[PDB]
Symmetry: D2
Subunit: 112 residues, 4 copies
């Protein structure tokens, strides 16, 4: 069934890259996306989307993407449930990126 997400935002931290003994690399980062419908002084808010990326895309994210860089994301919305180390159920909604595009560096509105 149809499931498509497109985002443009800025990374809040530098991307992390973990791995499982199953041998696959899993990159994660948070995308801060300012709301367009409230972009005006006195009411600018952002949403913070969790993006997850795997395999090849995941390493090109760790190399070339840094905290504060503008990135575009294209993917699916997916949900998980796990148990944290305390025994509480955790429900997650993340964007699984099919492609991540590097748009602008960290400080492009003062450097340009």
């Amino acid at each position: 069934m149809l499931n498509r997400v497109v985002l443009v935002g800025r990374l809040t931290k530098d991307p992390e890259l973990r791995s499982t003994p199953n041998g696959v690399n899993v990159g994660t980062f948070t995308l801060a996306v300012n709301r367009t419908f409230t972009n005006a002084q006195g009411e600018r808010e952002a949403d913070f989307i969790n993006v997850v990326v795997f395999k090849k895309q995941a390493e090109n994210v760790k190399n070339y993407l840094s905290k504060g860089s503008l990135a575009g994301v294209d993917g699916r919305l997916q949900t998980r449930n796990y148990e944290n180390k305390d025994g509480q159920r955790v429900f997650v909604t993340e964007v699984v990126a099919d492609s991540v595009q590097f748009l602008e560096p960290k400080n492009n509105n003062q450097q340009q």
Copy 2:
């Protein structure tokens, strides 16, 4: 900034419609979206997206949408943080629908 979600899935329960004394109606429902990339016998999984709808769209959802109906959704991805009644922080990612389209009823693959 760009933020677009498009979904087609089936409702897991009947939509709920709450209200605040601020006088605005807030409709909510969960959309179950089968993954396209695993649609085959032996590996069909779905993701369960929380959709939120307001004002007029929200009532036309409660009238005309029921558990098991196929619905299409178009909107933004948004995040909230609140405190539940126990004092734990709760982080939510939901789809805020701009439009909700009614596609097929509950039992359309046996009635058609």
Copy 3:
């Protein structure tokens, strides 16, 4: 760069199916997409989008999709030339009717 199109409409005619000299199936159809909001006059307009789909999905388009069938399409917007033509290249198609 990002390029994504998502559509839901009905086919105007029956899906067509050709092949490439490389042996790849090329399914085509036109989708009538009603506008969700009416226009200044109140009438409902539809747009007529040309969709293209490849390989085995194109065969399932030919088998299970007919004139008037409701379909969802997910893909890219691409431009071709001779007369400039724009079509949606579907990587995914969803069959909303049996």
Copy 4:
């Protein structure tokens, strides 16, 4: 019915700005959208999409957007006629450069 297009590309020429006899500003520009994946030969192709934007957004397109400027576009796919023309009608435009 659902109809959504999202694009990121660069303008091929300078944005144009006309008006309707009803007094609404109509901004137009062409966006060159590079394909993310290369083709069977390995070359990178771009698509050239016609974008249309209205009212005050069209004015901010004329002020702040120039040939070669990077822009994001969010809107509908619509079809017009005389020669069949398909354009993206932008409800939102994002300026990726100052």
